[PDB]
RNA sequence: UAUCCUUUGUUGCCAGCGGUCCGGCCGGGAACUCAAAGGAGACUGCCAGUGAUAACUGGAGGAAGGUGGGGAUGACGUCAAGUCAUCAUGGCCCUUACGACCAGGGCUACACACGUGCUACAAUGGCGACUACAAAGAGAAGCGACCUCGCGAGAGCAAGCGGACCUCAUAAAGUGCGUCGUAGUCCGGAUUGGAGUCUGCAACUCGACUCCAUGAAGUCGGAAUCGCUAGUAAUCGUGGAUCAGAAU
């Protein structure tokens, strides 16, 4: 069944089926069974409705989907504008030598490529 | 450092002569020394090789 | 890319002391002049001041900072930023 | 009743030193049990031969822990006074 | 029977004969439930119809090297008649063990597939060379 | 190293008896295993066949037989083989500098090419719990029982041995029970993000390791070519030398 965010696990065990989570892993998968009493041998297919529905409502509370990579994004973007190789490195479209890389520089890299 | 090596100071402070510690003579490393040499772990192997310390010697298997 | 091999440089002169601190927690700001040393552990949560060759900054050392040089959070010329300057 | 148990590095030094420590106690005291071999615990080492290539060479090293018993029963006052006196073996660990 | 001994020893690997004999008397058990036939008997023929006779050897007389066929002897067509069955077992798609060896075991003696084909083959190498027959040897 | 015997036993074992918190543990005794030393033992001698002889072939006896099996050992000489940075040595050459100290930088820089290796694709399998057997080795500031804290690495505390009586150890596969279905998958682990441990004066190009997250290529491979005949191949795990630490 649908638990957090786009998620369809079918065909398996309640434990490994929570493991295709991008938040959960193992770990995670037996405490959340024992905190809402669920046999981690049972199938999806074999789960009653009232038994995902107290699934759902605890494995809600936690962080995952987008909101998260963009979380990525904006930290991979601080050390980008500013002067931090580490930053530069992310984009490698920087110089890698020690000649320019500006200009002049076909002789390693061939035809110009479009911007 | 400097500041650290306050151990120079001959009388302690508020606490007893016992305060006193060690600090190695060449670097000034507190954590392990050589109280027969005074010098620390690290001294003692680069002053044993240069064979700057007297009667000391490299034990041979 | 950046290099370092095996031996990481912290100046004695900014590396002893600060360990002096640690006896109970930390001490407030320092000053050290040697920028060239590099941030590590014992260094996080103490605010050290680098100089800029006209003053010092104090610079809150974070372990995130860890790392990185003292100087690279030291910035040697001044720009005002001659606008609205906001952000 | 007095066990002597003589253990040592060199086979040579023990087969020495528990011989004499046999014929002196063999006047004063009884015939004593008689010295004795007993299991030896080896210790070897397998190190290369030649420090290059030749992988397959690598020589077998040992170095073993002799011991022995002797064992003198029926001592007699002259019987430890041949012992004490004369000690000669030094790589020979003694244990009466 | 010593062939039975023989053949739960070309399926043991490992060293696990004790699963070996498992799987192979419940391939005879399985045997008997599909064919109305005993076990023992369906065994035997299975390992009958997959032995050759005369093999062609390669040897240089003079000048090239000839094709001369060859008789064989028995106690080689017993091993290759075992190691065949295992492998040719080892090929069907379904996945029970006990399985494969119970349906290779009757499709052997109703005859057809590759090893059957190896069979015309070398029987068609034979005879074509009838040319060179009297050297029996 | 393989069989046997003699000498010897705080290893061994009710083999035999007695006690047993039934752990050799104790009493006790050396048989057995083992440990160590010495010694015994194959030599074609016997039987049949062939042969001029040597010897070859078959067979009995026998623990092993025809050099039973593994080591060290490598002829006159060759390539003017390698090393004068192991060392020694003839000639030649330099002696403010092709000597010395110190601070700071690389060898692990890449579009590619090669050699030598490693890890792979499963259910005669993977995983979790429980549980049964090995040998050879290592340990002084070192191996680290046990306890406590932490998911763990590890940390704090701390017994014992100096060691065939304390520790490294848990042996792994194996066995019993349960779980997983053929899809790039509970196959496969690359790469990358975050956190942390440990060694070391100090690991941003240059560490190993632990945990979480991510989880690629790969579904077995175009022309040639390599390793082996018995407890060996193949396969699985373990200890050691070098050593503070990159050994696949």
């Given at each position: 069944?649908?638990?957090?965010?786009?998620?369809?696990?079918?065909?398996?065990?309640?434990?490994?089926?929570?493991?295709?989570?991008?938040?959960?892993?193992?770990?995670?998968?037996?405490?959340?069974?024992?905190?809402?009493?669920?046999?981690?041998?049972?199938?999806?297919?074999?789960?009653?409705?009232?038994?995902?529905?107290?699934?759902?409502?605890?494995?809600?509370?936690?962080?995952?989907?987008?909101?998260?990579?963009?979380?990525?994004?904006?930290?991979?973007?601080?050390?980008?504008?500013?002067?931090?190789?580490?930053?530069?490195?992310?984009?490698?479209?920087?110089?890698?030598?020690?000649?320019?890389?500006?200009?002049?520089?076909?002789?390693?890299?061939?035809?110009?490529?479009?911007? | 450092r400097?500041?650290?090596?306050?151990?120079?100071?001959?009388?302690?402070?508020?606490?007893?002569?016992?305060?006193?510690?060690?600090?190695?003579?060449?670097?000034?490393?507190?954590?392990?020394?050589?109280?027969?040499?005074?010098?620390?772990?690290?001294?003692?192997?680069?002053?044993?090789?240069?064979?700057?310390?007297?009667?000391?010697?490299?034990?041979?298997? | 890319?950046?290099?370092?091999?095996?031996?990481?440089?912290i100046?004695?002169?900014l590396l002893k002391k600060v360990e002096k601190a640690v006896?109970?927690?930390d001490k407030?700001?320092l000053?050290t002049?040697?920028?060239?040393?590099?941030?590590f552990?014992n260094m996080?949560?103490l605010?050290i001041?680098?100089?800029?060759?006209?003053?010092?900054?104090?610079?809150?050392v974070?372990?995130?900072?860890?790392?990185?040089?003292?100087?690279?959070?030291?910035?040697?010329?001044?720009?005002?930023?001659?606008?609205?300057?906001?952000? | 009743?007095?066990?002597?148990?003589?253990?040592?590095?060199?086979?040579?030094?023990?087969?020495?030193?528990?011989?004499?420590?046999?014929?002196?106690?063999?006047?004063?005291?009884?015939?004593?049990?008689?010295?004795?071999?007993?299991?030896?615990?080896?210790?070897?080492?397998?190190?290369?031969?030649?420090?290059?290539?030749?992988?397959?060479?690598?020589?077998?090293?040992?170095?073993?822990?002799?011991?022995?018993?002797?064992?003198?029963?029926?001592?007699?006052?002259?019987?430890?006074?041949?012992?004490?006196?004369?000690?000669?073996?030094?790589?020979?660990?003694?244990?009466? | 029977?010593?062939?039975?001994?023989?053949?739960?020893?070309?399926?043991?690997?490992?060293?696990?004969?004790?699963?070996?004999?498992?799987?192979?008397?419940?391939?005879?058990?399985?045997?008997?439930?599909?064919?109305?036939?005993?076990?023992?008997?369906?065994?035997?023929?299975?390992?009958?119809?997959?032995?050759?006779?005369?093999?062609?050897?390669?040897?240089?007389?003079?000048?090239?090297?000839?094709?001369?066929?060859?008789?064989?002897?028995?106690?080689?067509?017993?091993?290759?008649?075992?190691?065949?069955?295992?492998?040719?077992?080892?090929?069907?798609?379904?996945?029970?063990?006990?399985?494969?060896?119970?349906?290779?075991?009757?499709?052997?003696?109703?005859?057809?597939?590759?090893?059957?084909?190896?069979?015309?083959?070398?029987?068609?190498?034979?005879?074509?060379?009838?040319?060179?027959?009297?050297?029996?040897?």
């Open positions: 069944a649908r638990i957090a965010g786009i998620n369809i696990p079918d065909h398996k065990h309640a434990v490994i089926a929570l493991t295709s989570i991008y938040g959960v892993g193992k770990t995670r998968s037996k405490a959340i069974l024992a905190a809402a009493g669920i046999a981690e041998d049972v199938k999806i297919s074999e789960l009653s409705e009232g038994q995902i529905d107290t699934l759902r409502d605890e494995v809600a509370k936690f962080v995952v989907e987008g909101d998260l990579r963009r979380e990525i994004s904006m930290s991979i973007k601080r050390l980008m504008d500013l002067g931090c190789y580490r930053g530069l490195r992310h984009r490698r479209g920087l110089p890698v030598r020690g000649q320019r890389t500006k200009t002049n520089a076909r002789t390693r890299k061939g035809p110009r490529k479009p911007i | 400097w500041n650290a090596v306050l151990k120079l100071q001959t009388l302690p402070r508020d606490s007893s002569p016992s305060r006193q510690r060690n600090r190695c003579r060449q670097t000034g490393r507190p954590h392990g020394f050589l109280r027969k040499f005074g010098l620390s772990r690290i001294k003692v192997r680069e002053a044993a090789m240069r064979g700057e310390i007297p009667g000391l010697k490299k034990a041979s298997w | 890319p950046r290099s370092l091999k095996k031996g990481p440089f100046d004695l002169h006896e109970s927690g407030k700001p000053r002049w040697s920028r060239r040393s590099t941030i552990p996080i949560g605010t001041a680098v100089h800029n060759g006209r003053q010092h900054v104090p610079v809150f974070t372990d995130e900072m860890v790392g990185h040089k003292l100087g690279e959070f030291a910035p040697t010329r001044t720009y005002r930023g001659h606008a609205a300057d906001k952000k | 009743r007095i066990r002597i148990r003589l253990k040592a590095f060199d086979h040579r030094l023990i087969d020495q030193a528990t011989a004499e420590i046999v014929e002196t106690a063999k006047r004063t005291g009884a015939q004593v049990r008689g010295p004795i071999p007993l299991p030896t615990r080896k210790e070897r080492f397998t190190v290369l031969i030649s420090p290059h290539v030749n992988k397959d060479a690598r020589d077998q090293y040992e170095i073993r822990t002799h011991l022995r018993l002797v064992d003198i029963v029926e001592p007699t006052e002259k019987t430890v006074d041949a012992l004490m006196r004369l000690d000669l073996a030094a790589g020979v660990d003694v244990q009466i | 029977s010593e062939l039975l001994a023989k053949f739960v020893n070309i399926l043991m690997v490992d060293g696990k004969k004790s699963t070996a004999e498992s799987i192979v008397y419940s391939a005879l058990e399985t045997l008997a439930q599909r064919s109305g036939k005993s076990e023992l008997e369906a065994f035997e023929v299975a390992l009958e119809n997959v032995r050759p006779t005369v093999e062609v050897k390669s040897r240089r007389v003079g000048g090239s090297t000839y094709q001369v066929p060859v008789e064989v002897r028995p106690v080689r067509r017993n091993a290759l008649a075992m190691r065949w069955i295992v492998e040719a077992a080892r090929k069907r798609g379904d996945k029970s063990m006990a399985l494969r060896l119970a349906n290779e075991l009757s499709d052997a003696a109703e005859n057809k597939g590759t090893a059957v084909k190896k069979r015309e083959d070398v029987h068609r190498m034979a005879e074509a060379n009838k040319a060179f027959a009297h050297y029996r040897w």
